[PDB]
């Protein structure tokens, strides 16, 4: 589950501004890749890509 | 599952530029809320907030 639960209203483009605090727990930076894929209805899952989701 | 699988390397801020194609399947727009919460390791889940995940 993990869960942080920070709701973000996209913007005038469609990005979701992911605070560095999550990439911080990722231990990554402004070069962290993510895999944008929705799981179910409207939950988009962003996955670090480099190790995929687990390898 | 669903899955789209579009990898995006954050940026010099940390947003995940979510294509309107997903917000389109959301039937929403530049006022779509999402709940940023990671599931396990580095998979961040963004969900529309308004109906939450599934009410």
Q: For chain A, list the strands marked E by DSSP.
A: 6-9, 15-17, 33-38, 43-47
Indicate the number of domains in chain B: 1
Q: Which contiguous run of DSSP H or E holds residue B25?
A: helix B20-25
Nearest to B36 by CA among B19, B22, B53: B53
Question: Cβ distance A22 to B10 under 8 Å?
Answer: no
* A5 CB neighbour count, 10 Å cutoff: 12
Q: Collect all residues with Cβ–Cβ distance below 8 Å to A11 and sequence separation of at least 6.
A: A17, B30
- The runs of H, that is alpha helices, within chain A are 20-26
Identity of the residue in A1, A14, A38 whose CB atom sits nearest the CB atom of B20: A14
A17 bridge partner residues:
B15
CB contact residues (below 8 A), chain B span 14-53, against chain A:
14-20, 22-23, 25-26, 28, 30-49, 51, 53
- Domain residues for the domain of B33 are 1-55
The experimental method, as deposited, was NMR
What is the CATH number for B18? 2.10.260.10
What distance in Å separates the CA atoms of residue A25 and residue B22, rounded to the nearest whole number?
A: 26
């Amino acid at each position: 589950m993990k869960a942080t639960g920070i709701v973000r209203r996209i913007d005038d483009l469609g990005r979701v501004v992911i605070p560095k605090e999550i990439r911080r727990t990722l231990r990554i930076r402004e070069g962290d890749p993510l895999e944008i894929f929705v799981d179910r209805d409207g939950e988009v899952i962003l996955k670090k890509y480099s190790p995929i989701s687990e390898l």
